[PDB]
């Protein structure tokens, strides 16, 4: 529909509305307007760098090579992806996010060196 | 190890810890603060664009077709990557950096044109 159009909807119905939300991230007053705008640009750049160090740069969707440790969550695919909202999902896995990010970065690093070795083989 | 930790370490050792150094890259008091912050953002954008026009977007590490020239360094590979620090390397090639960038950019442009031509070859 629009910005946050499917925020309360099922998981998949939100999964193909990412473009709108991704696109809509961009004196007494002049200094404050500048502060807000530069805070926004810093946030966008941090998100872009976090994606880039995982190899998913330029793609809203992506795929990785870390196994999903069920300790973070054990719900099967149908329960998550047909009977749940994105806010509930972020609430559920809040603690583990950091760990996930770390593993993701590490996986990319390992993968990357492997790739270089392949490009080194004659 | 943490920020700049491998700076005094071997080339090979520091070449495994690029992310730790990449993520840490990024009333008058507010004025100077915003000037510094925008300068840092613009410098990160310098580097990001300069990698983007080199075909190396979103990869911390990237190989390219431009061949080495023994004039730039008469150096055995083992010396470079297992004996000599990064700072000494940046110092040694500080003269020739611009020609490397120019050749690299030209090669990337030629590669893009060839890729476009190949994709249309049907």
């Amino acid at each position: 529909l629009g910005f946050l159009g499917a925020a309360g909807s099922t998981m998949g119905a939100a999964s193909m509305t990412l473009t709108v939300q991704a696109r809509n991230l961009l004196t007494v007053w002049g200094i404050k307007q500048l502060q807000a705008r530069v805070l926004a640009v810093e946030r966008y750049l941090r998100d872009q760098q976090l994606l880039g160090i995982w190899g998913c740069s330029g793609k809203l969707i992506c795929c990785t090579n870390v196994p999903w440790n069920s300790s973070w969550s054990n719900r099967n695919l149908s329960e998550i992806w047909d009977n749940m909202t994105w806010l509930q999902w972020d609430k559920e896995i809040s603690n583990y996010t950091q760990i996930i990010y770390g593993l993701l970065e590490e996986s990319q690093n390992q993968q990357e060196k492997n790739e270089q070795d392949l490009l080194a083989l004659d | 190890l943490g920020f700049l930790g491998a700076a005094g370490s071997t080339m090979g050792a520091a070449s495994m810890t690029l992310t730790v150094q990449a993520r840490n890259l990024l009333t008058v008091w507010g004025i100077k603060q915003l000037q510094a912050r925008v300068l840092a953002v613009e410098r990160y954008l310098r580097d990001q664009q300069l990698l983007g026009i080199w075909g190396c977007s979103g990869k911390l590490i990237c190989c390219t077709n431009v061949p080495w020239n023994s004039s730039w360094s008469n150096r055995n590979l083992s010396e470079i990557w297992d004996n000599m620090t990064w700072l000494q390397w940046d110092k040694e090639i500080s003269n020739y950096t611009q020609i490397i960038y120019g050749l690299l950019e030209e090669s990337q442009n030629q590669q893009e044109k060839n890729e476009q031509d190949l994709l249309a070859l049907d």
Partner: antibody
Amino acid sequence: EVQLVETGGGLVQPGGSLKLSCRASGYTFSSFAMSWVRQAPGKGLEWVSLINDRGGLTFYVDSVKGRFTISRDNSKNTLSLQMHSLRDGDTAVYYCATGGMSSALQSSKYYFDFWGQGALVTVS
Amino acid sequence: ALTQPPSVSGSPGQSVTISCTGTSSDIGSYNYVSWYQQHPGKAPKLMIYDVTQRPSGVSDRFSGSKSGNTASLTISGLQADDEADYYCSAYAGRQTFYIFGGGTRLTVL
């Protein structure tokens, strides 16, 4: 001077499986690729598999793509290869050997520096 | 596989040569053709690597060269200690990493 020794089953039955192990000592095992090569009891040598130093990549001849799997522990300085559903052509002496490919960062090698005593494998 | 002579013979004091030849894809493209020695029933040993480079601790009598699709290994002196089988080892790019030829016999009188 590096000691490169091996151990593994010598006799097996067709359709089974085995695991060869290799122990190396006298150098930096973490900075050197490894490779499993075989020589039939009367015939010449034949490359089997090649493994990078970091123990992340794998390479095999087309014969045993889905049957062999080679791994390596770096801290304990050890290599291993598990053969599954082996056939009779595998009856041969298997040698461990360093080298085979450098790690993209030191001098290209493309050979086999050290050679261990080998181990014979036979199947009924 | 590669193609090598089955055997060679020679007396001490002279020199002999062994050839190894294959497809143009491997020998012609890449100058990576090593030579290994295997004494009877003993562990093989690496005699030559690349096309000419000599390993540490290997006598000068061993030498090598590449010409087009062929690669030759020349032994001089022939002190009769190297009464061992010789093999060539050619690198053939990706998906075909190392290939060898028929085992060569070096006879010494």
